[PDB]
Amino acid sequence: MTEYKLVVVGAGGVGKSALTIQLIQNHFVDEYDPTIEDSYRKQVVIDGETCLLDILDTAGQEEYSAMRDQYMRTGEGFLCVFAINNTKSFEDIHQYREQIKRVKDSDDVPMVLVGNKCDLAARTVESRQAQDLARSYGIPYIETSAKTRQGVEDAFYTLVREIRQH
Ligand SMILES: Nc1nc2c(ncn2[C@@H]2O[C@H](COP(=O)(O)OP(=O)(O)NP(=O)(O)O)[C@@H](O)[C@H]2O)c(=O)[nH]1
Ligand SMILES: [Mg+2]
């Protein structure tokens, strides 16, 4: 069956792992558990297609940049995640996108911009600003909560649909 290699990137603590674990294991992880590199494989049916999602969960910490680059190289699509209460993680998106472009030698790779932690009332990044950034890159913007599961399937399934249209 078709295998889609999806890579989840973004600053430390934005919820990359929580989103992935919500998808795969149906539970919200509330603990402090920094990732080095983890990979998940799950068989799913998306729009009637049987496919294997191979999800590569990366570290947000800059010490692991080399390893992150190796993994980004094999990826077919990327989830670029920031948190809606963390303005620095939003600013850092440009830098993760630029690295993806350099690693893939491409101006256009299937990607979705994800604004996570949308359950939180204390928002510092407005949906309007994120949407303007996404439009400037030519990619979809999805808001998610790993805590409530809002947007979780949408983010991953939208990415797969983008890979299908590349
Ligand atoms: N309220 C809320 N909290 C979240 C959400 N997603 C993650 N968190 C919390 O934020 C913290 C970090 O989440 P985690 O998934 O570990 O982030 P990460 O991006 O994978 N960090 P790293 O880059 O170190 O691997 C955890 O305490 C987690 O429970 C969310 O959608 N809403
Ligand atoms: Mg993590």
Residue numbers in the entry: 1 to 166
Provide the authors' original text about this structure.
To minimize potential experimental bias and to provide accurate comparisons between structures, we have first solved a reference structure of Ras(wt) in complex with Mg2+·GppNHp at room temperature (RT) and ambient pressure (AP) in the same experimental set-up and environments. The Mg2+-ion is, as expected, hexa-coordinated with one oxygen each from the β- and γ-phosphates, the two side chain hydroxyl groups of Ser 17 (from the P-loop) and Thr 35 (from the switch I) and two structural water molecules, termed here W1 and W2. In our structures of Ras(wt) and Ras(D33K) at ambient pressure, Gln 61 is oriented toward the nucleotide while this residue is usually oriented toward a symmetric molecule in the crystalline packing.
Ras structure consists of a central β-sheet core (β1–β6) surrounded by a bundle of 5 α-helices (α1–α5).
